[PDB]
Design a protein around this ligand. Structure first.
Ligand SMILES: [Zn+2]
Ligand SMILES: [Zn+2]
Ligand SMILES: [Zn+2]
Ligand SMILES: [Zn+2]
Ligand SMILES: [Zn+2]
Ligand SMILES: [Zn+2]
Ligand SMILES: [Zn+2]
Ligand SMILES: [Zn+2]
Ligand SMILES: [Zn+2]
Ligand SMILES: [Zn+2]
Ligand SMILES: [Zn+2]
Ligand SMILES: [Zn+2]
Ligand SMILES: [Zn+2]
Ligand SMILES: [Zn+2]
Ligand SMILES: [Zn+2]
Lengths: 116, 115, 116, 115
């Protein structure tokens, strides 16, 4: 996959499963244009989002739905999404894994970028 | 402070000092409206961004400029900013510290919400 | 303080308050010698652990008690402590703030080292 | 694998490849007894460390060698190792992935426990 997203639940020590992910690309008018979406698998991963030929150099935003994810805990999170913005392919095509460790009021987002 | 931003440099083990921070609020048309701005202090902290008159419930973005912060390392980072979006005051007036521990290809963040 | 420890609760979005912290220094027999301890304040901070005189060059471990912190939560954490080992003052005195953002199955430990 | 270790480099945005990992288990006299070891693969993963016959409930330390890892950075890190301690299996036989996301003066780690 040129772009894969992987989500892990730091509170329970598990992959975050069946979580909705939206990816946007910044367009010329500076709006975020929908680019791809899906739900994470059993392993927390969302594969098959895009193709090389769609994944052009640009600025992309990944939004992971968190509003309801934390409900059985009893906690409403800092925001309805966990978000990270990254710049892609600005030095030639690369593959990206965006890995997110999530808690209600903290997370990390790491971009693992490899030369295909 | 209703909103304070603290930025640490995870590569060097130091506050991120004199880094430009921009705060925006999501507007009615779904664009980011400029809300506040400043540079971090010697301690990595940015105080005095807003007041309760102005900081109503809504969706805010903290954007920290990182494009050249890394330059001396020799690393171009994953993006020219580090961001965090949070929803405020969804249940009354609450002081927020947004803490960001930054590296070029990973960053953590915390929202600490009190009072 | 030459050494300060600050603990944030990533699940609730708060300082972690009244949490016990232990600090050890690695002795010559390669056991961990007790060095200082305390409980964090309302800001999640623990000040006054040591003095410059006592805080000699060495390898230190900070252990933050987590076992029951996460009980009201309904979660057993990955370990009874969150722990961070660091090497101190090996290029002259420095002051250290050890900052931990904690969730039951993830945490981040950052050493902020400043030279007076 | 009953236990897998994955190591990412947050400074460069890459798996941490060919890094040495030791795993210890706390012994009866409170010292760390060597338990397993290996080097991460090109994906930053270390498989095959143990089996259920050997991986009983207890306290384990995963130690990743970092002293010279960011020497090319020009950075001496916060300690020559990055270390995570976890209590294993404490409720029956689980599979554990220990994921470490490293910078010289910070890291983010995580135990993913599945059944
Ligand atoms: Zn894939
Ligand atoms: Zn959604
Ligand atoms: Zn959002
Ligand atoms: Zn303030
Ligand atoms: Zn700017
Ligand atoms: Zn007003
Ligand atoms: Zn940006
Ligand atoms: Zn102090
Ligand atoms: Zn002295
Ligand atoms: Zn204790
Ligand atoms: Zn322990
Ligand atoms: Zn395996
Ligand atoms: Zn070794
Ligand atoms: Zn056996
Ligand atoms: Zn060590």
């Amino acid at each position: 996959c040129p772009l894969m997203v992987k989500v892990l639940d730091a509170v329970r020590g598990s992959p975050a499963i069946n979580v909705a992910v939206h990816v946007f690309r910044k367009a010329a008018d500076d709006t975020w244009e929908p680019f791809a979406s899906g739900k994470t698998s059993e392993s927390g991963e969302l594969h098959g989002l895009t193709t090389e030929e769609e994944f052009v150099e640009g600025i992309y935003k990944v939004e992971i739905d968190t509003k309801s994810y934390w409900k059985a805990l009893g906690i409403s999170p800092m925001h309805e999404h966990a978000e990270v913005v990254f710049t892609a392919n600005d030095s030639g095509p690369r593959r990206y894994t965006i890995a997110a460790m999530l808690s209600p009021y903290s997370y990390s987002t790491t971009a693992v970028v490899t030369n295909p």
